[PDB]
A paper describes a structure:
Protein ADP-ribosylation is a highly dynamic post-translational modification. The rapid turnover is achieved, among others, by ADP-(ribosyl)hydrolases (ARHs), an ancient family of enzymes that reverses this modification. Reversal of the bulk of PAR modification is mediated by poly(ADP-ribosyl)glycohydrolase (PARG) converting the polymer chain to a mono(ADP-ribosyl) (MAR) modification (Lin et al., 1997, Slade et al., 2011). For example, linkages to glutamate/aspartate are hydrolyzed by macrodomain proteins (Jankevicius et al., 2013, Rosenthal et al., 2013, Sharifi et al., 2013), whereas linkages to arginine and serine are cleaved by [name] and ARH3, respectively, two members of the structurally unrelated (ADP-ribosyl)hydrolases (ARHs) family (Fontana et al., 2017, Moss et al., 1988).
We then solved the crystal structures of apo- and ADPr-bound LchARH3, as well as the structure of the hARH1:ADPr complex. In the hARH1:ADPr complex, the interactions of the adenosine and proximal ribose occur primarily through quasidomain D due to a relative movement of the adenosine moiety by 8.4 Å and a rotation of ∼105°. The adenosine group lies against the protein surface and interacts directly with Ser124, Gly127, and Ser270, while the interaction with Thr167 is bridged via a water molecule (w570). The environment-facing site is shielded by π stacking with Tyr263. The latter is part of a rigid adenosine binding loop (Ser262 to Gly271) which is stabilized by the presence of two structural water molecules (w577 and w618) and coordinates the proximal ribose via the 2′ and 3′ OH. The pyrophosphate coordination is comparable in its arrangement with ARH3 and involves interactions with the buried residues Gly130 and His163, which are absolutely conserved in both [name] and ARH3, as well as a short non-conserved surface motif (Gly101/Ala102/Ser103). In the hARH1 model, the 2″OH is located between and coordinated by both Mg2+ ions, while the 3″ OH makes contact with MgII as well as Asp302. In the electron density map, we observed positive density extending from the α-face of the anomeric carbon. Yet, presence of this density supports the notion that the modeled ADPr is in a catalytically meaningful conformation. In contrast, the proximal ribose in [name] is coordinated by the rigid adenosine binding loop (loop 16).
Residue numbers in the entry: -1 to 357
The structure:
C-alpha cells in the first residue's frame, strides 16, 4: 500500500506551510540568516511543536482543491469538477482570518460564478503570475497519477490555476505542482522531473490553444516561465533528465537567499508561479530522504517561505511518508484530521485508474 504517502503528502504540505509561516512572523524579518537564528533559539526543527502555528492560505486553498476533487468522485464530468473547484475556492475565503491570503487569489475567488456556464473563467491579466495557483495544485497529481490520465492532469491543473491566475507564469506553476506530485506517486527519480515538465509544456500550450480563451495573450507571455525553468535546469545540469544535479560549492543560508532572489520576479524568491515550485524542487533535489534538510532549504528562507514549503512538503511526503519527521511537527497541526480524511479519500480515487468526461 501507498496510503501513508497520500496522508503524508497532505499533512506535511500543511506542516511545511505552518512552519514556513510561523503565524506571519517570518515576514517582518524577510531574512534567511535571522530566521535560522530564531529556529536555533526555539530548539531547532525537531523541537518545534506546531500546536499554535496556524496554517496559512496555502493549506486552506490546497484543502479546497482536494475537497473539490473528492466531492467530484469517480469518472467525473469536468464541468462538475470545475463547478466544485470554483465553489470551494470562493467558499474557503471565509477561513482566511490570520492567514494572509494573496491578491489575485482573493480578488478572483470573489468574481467566480460557480453554477453558471463557464462561470469559473476569468480574463487574462498581466499581474496574475503569483504562486497562489501553484501552492494549491499538488493534490491534482494525487487524484490523477496514471499515465493514461496525463491530459486530465494538464487540463485540471491549468483550469484550477486560471480560476484565479490567468497568466502562464501563474497557471504553469499549478501544472508543475500537480505533475511533480504524480511523478512522486509513481516513484519517478526527482532528477528526471524538470525534463518531464519541459517536454510536457508543448502539450500544455496545445490545450491553451484548443480551449480557445485569450490565446494571443497566453502564448505571448509563455516565454517567461519556460525560459526561467530551462535556465534553472541548465544551471543544475539536469536538462537531460539522466544525470544527478550539481550545486554551488558555497550554498549555505545566505547564498540560498541571494539565489532565490535571483530567480524571483519582484525580489522575493518563491512569490510567483515559476519560482515557488522551482525552489521547492531545488530543496527536494538537495535533501533526499532528509526532512530537516528539506525544511532548512524550503521552509526557512527570506522569500515566500510558507508557499515554497507547502509545495516541497507535499512532494517530500509522497516520496518518504513520515520517516525522520519529529511528531511535534504535525501531531497537533491545525486541520490534521481533516487533511488525513481527505488524503484517504484521494487515495481511494487516485489508486484506482479511471477516466473523466472532458469538456
Ligand atoms: N506576471 C508575473 N510574473 C511573475 N510574478 C508575478 C506576476 N504577476 C505577479 N507576480 C508576483 O506575484 C506576487 C503577488 O502575488 P499575489 O497575487 O499577491 O498572491 P497570490 O494570489 O498568488 O497568492 C499566493 C501568496 O499569497 C499568500 O501570502 C501565500 O502565502 C502566497 O505567498 C507579486 O508580489 C509578484 O512577485
Ligand atoms: Cl533546525
Ligand atoms: Cl481537522
Ligand atoms: Cl485535527
Ligand atoms: Mg500563505
Ligand atoms: Mg506565501
Amino acid at each position: 500500500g501507498g496510503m501513508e504517502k497520500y496522508v503524508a503528502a497532505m499533512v506535511l504540505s500543511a506542516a511545511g506551510d505552518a512552519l514556513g509561516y510561523y503565524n506571519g512572523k517570518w515576514e517582518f524579518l524577510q531574512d534567511g540568516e535571522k530566521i535560522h537564528r530564531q529556529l536555533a533559539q526555539l530548539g531547532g526543527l525537531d523541537a518545534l511543536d506546531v500546536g499554535r502555528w496556524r496554517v496559512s492560505d496555502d493549506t486552506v486553498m490546497h484543502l479546497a482543491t482536494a475537497e473539490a476533487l473528492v466531492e467530484a468522485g469517480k469518472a467525473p464530468k469536468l464541468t462538475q469538477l470545475y463547478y466544485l473547484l470554483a465553489k470551494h475556492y470562493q467558499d474557503c475565503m471565509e477561513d482566511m482570518d490570520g492567514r494572509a491570503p494573496g491578491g489575485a487569489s482573493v480578488h478572483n475567488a470573489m468574481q467566480l460564478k460557480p453554477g453558471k456556464p463557464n462561470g469559473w473563467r476569468i480574463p487574462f491579466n498581466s499581474h496574475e503570475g503569483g504562486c497562489g495557483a501553484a501552492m494549491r495544485a499538488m493534490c491534482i497529481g494525487l487524484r490523477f497519477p496514471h499515465h493514461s490520465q496525463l491530459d486530465t492532469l494538464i487540463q485540471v491543473s491549468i483550469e484550477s490555476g486560471r480560476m484565479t491566475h490567468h497568466h502562464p507564469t501563474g497557471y504553469l506553476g499549478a501544472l508543475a505542482s500537480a505533475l511533480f506530485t504524480a511523478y512522486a506517486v509513481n516513484s519517478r527519480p526527482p532528477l528526471q522531473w524538470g525534463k518531464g515538465l519541459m517536454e510536457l509544456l508543448p502539450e500544455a500550450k496545445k490545450y491553451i490553444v484548443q480551449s480557445g480563451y485569450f490565446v494571443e495573450e497566453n502564448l505571448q507571455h509563455w516565454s517567461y516561465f519556460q525560459t526561467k525553468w530551462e535556465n534553472y535546469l541548465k544551471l543544475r545540469g539536469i536538462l537531460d533528465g539522466e544525470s544527478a544535479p550539481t550545486f554551488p560549492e558555497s550554498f549555505g543560508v545566505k547564498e540560498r537567499d541571494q539565489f532565490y532572489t535571483s530567480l524571483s520576479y519582484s525580489g522575493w524568491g518563491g512569490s510567483s508561479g515559476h519560482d515557488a515550485p522551482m525552489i521547492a524542487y531545488d530543496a527536494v533535489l538537495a535533501a533526499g530522504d532528509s526532512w530537516k534538510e528539506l525544511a532548512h532549504r524550503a521552509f526557512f528562507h527570506g522569500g515566500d517561505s510558507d508557499s515554497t514549503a507547502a509545495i516541497a512538503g507535499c512532494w517530500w511526503g509522497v516520496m518518504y511518508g513520515f520517516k525522520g519527521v519529529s511528531p511535534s511537527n504535525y501531531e497537533k497541526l491545525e486541520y490534521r484530521n481533516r487533511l488525513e480524511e481527505t488524503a484517504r479519500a484521494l487515495y481511494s480515487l487516485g489508486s484506482k485508474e479511471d477516466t473523466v468526461i472532458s469538456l
